[PDB]
């Protein structure tokens, strides 16, 4: 089974350029259309272009000012998107997607690559447990993830085995540092008789942290 996988989140200074990879894990990009589709925070999908490797033809949307360059690997396994002269409006999630050459749609999609255009420096998060002040019949716990850059952080409870009752909130930026929080609600008969652990991963700083509540 065939899976598009993109390279990791990126941070680039205003004015520079970013290049992103898209790999057809255990598949191929011959006989296919690959496309790059960006998405500004809380905005819609916008087509940047698409490249057919067999007809060796690239196509681009206007609105990019000749700023996009879409290519592909000689093994014809890997696809590249390149965006030059980065401005702060280029902060976006960049997806690649693949579809049949005969058809007009895209049934295969990468996970997306977050590109953040900023001069700010990388900073691992502080991860604070939120414990029930000082019992009811249901109790809410939480983690506070503070002071990190850039996005993303990944948060889980109990290494993923706890996902029911969870609210993980969108990160918010204040003075170039993000803040994230998450609550999990359990029934008291449960806590603290069982560990409930916050797991925070932050690949930009290579940090994985656990916090038992």
């Amino acid at each position: 089974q065939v899976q598009l996988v993109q390279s990791g989140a990126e941070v680039k200074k205003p004015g520079s350029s970013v290049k992103v990879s898209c790999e057809a894990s255990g598949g191929t990009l011959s006989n296919y259309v690959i496309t790059w589709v960006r998405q500004a925070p809380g905005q819609g999908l916008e087509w940047m272009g698409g490249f057919i490797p067999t007809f060796r033809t690239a196509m681009y949307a206007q609105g990019f000012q000749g700023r996009v360059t879409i290519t592909a690997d000689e093994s014809t396994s890997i696809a590249y998107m390149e965006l030059t002269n980065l401005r702060s409006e280029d902060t976006a999630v960049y997806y690649c997607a693949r579809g049949p050459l005969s058809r007009g749609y895209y049934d295969y999609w990468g996970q997306g690559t977050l590109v953040t255009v900023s001069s700010a420096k990388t900073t691992a998060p502080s991860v604070y447990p939120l414990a029930p002040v000082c019992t009811g019949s249901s109790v809410t716990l939480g983690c506070l993830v503070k002071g990190y850059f850039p996005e993303p952080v990944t948060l889980t409870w109990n290494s993923g085995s706890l996902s029911s009752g969870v609210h993980t909130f969108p990160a918010v930026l204040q003075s170039d540092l993000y803040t994230l929080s998450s609550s999990v609600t359990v029934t008291s008969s449960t806590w603290p008789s069982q560990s409930i652990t916050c797991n925070v991963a932050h690949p930009a700083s290579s940090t994985k942290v656990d916090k038992k509540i």
């Binding site: 999609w109 029930p132 939480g142 969108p170």
Partner: protein, 212 residues
């Protein structure tokens, strides 16, 4: 330059039928594709070529295309269907997406479940002090938090973030974080956060004292 006009929202009772329009200029002679994007995820193809459905997609999802309007039709809608939806065509060597339509599912009013949390030891030890307030599983979406410190409303150092409509119970949730220094936090005793919401005449208030 070819435009696709979707509505920004569609709202449907659970179990009832949702219809999302993709207004296109003579769109009916184009092939129309539809995508679903849940919060946090990548787009997923749910209808291709007007009306064809990839394997894996429920039959509840159905498409049509004629005149100047293509339509995605989701019947017996459940909370799992809450997502942004996009339609897609080709025109003159370019791909075009309509702006997102957000599908929200209806449900009954619910008062916020409110919880307050003093700084952690770890954070006091670092010189920081954050007071966190979760306002959870309420409906409808509009809500307001007020922070009082020793009786007086405080507005600075407050950070807010909202969830998307919950994927299983169709409610909404809010986090509020008031951040001070360990010093400023210890120049005071009473920390208070209060939730004002449609479902109540009086604000729901949680509070604590540094003392205990």
């Amino acid at each position: 330059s070819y435009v696709l006009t979707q509505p920004p929202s569609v709202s449907v009772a659970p179990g009832k039928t949702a219809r999302i329009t993709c207004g296109g200029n003579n769109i009916g002679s184009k092939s129309v594709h539809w995508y679903q994007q849940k919060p946090g995820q990548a787009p997923v193809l749910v209808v291709y070529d007007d009306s064809d459905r990839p394997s894996g997609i429920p039959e509840r999802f159905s498409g049509s295309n004629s005149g100047n309007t293509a339509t995605l039709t989701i019947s017996r809608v459940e909370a799992g269907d809450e997502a942004d939806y996009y339609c897609q065509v080709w025109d003159s060597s370019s791909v075009v997406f309509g702006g997102w339509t957000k599908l929200t599912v209806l449900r009954a009013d619910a008062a916020p479940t409110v919880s307050i949390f003093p700084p952690s030891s770890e954070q006091l030890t670092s010189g920081g002090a954050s007071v966190v307030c979760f306002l959870n599983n309420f409906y409808p979406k509009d809500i307001n938090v007020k922070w009082k410190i020793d009786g007086s409303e405080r507005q600075n150092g407050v950070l807010n973030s909202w969830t998307d409509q919950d994927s299983k119970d169709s409610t909404y949730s809010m986090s509020s974080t008031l951040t001070l220094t360990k010093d400023e936090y210890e120049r005071h005793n009473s920390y208070t956060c209060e939730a004002t919401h449609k479902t109540s005449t009086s604000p729901i208030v949680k509070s604590f004292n540094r003392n205990e």
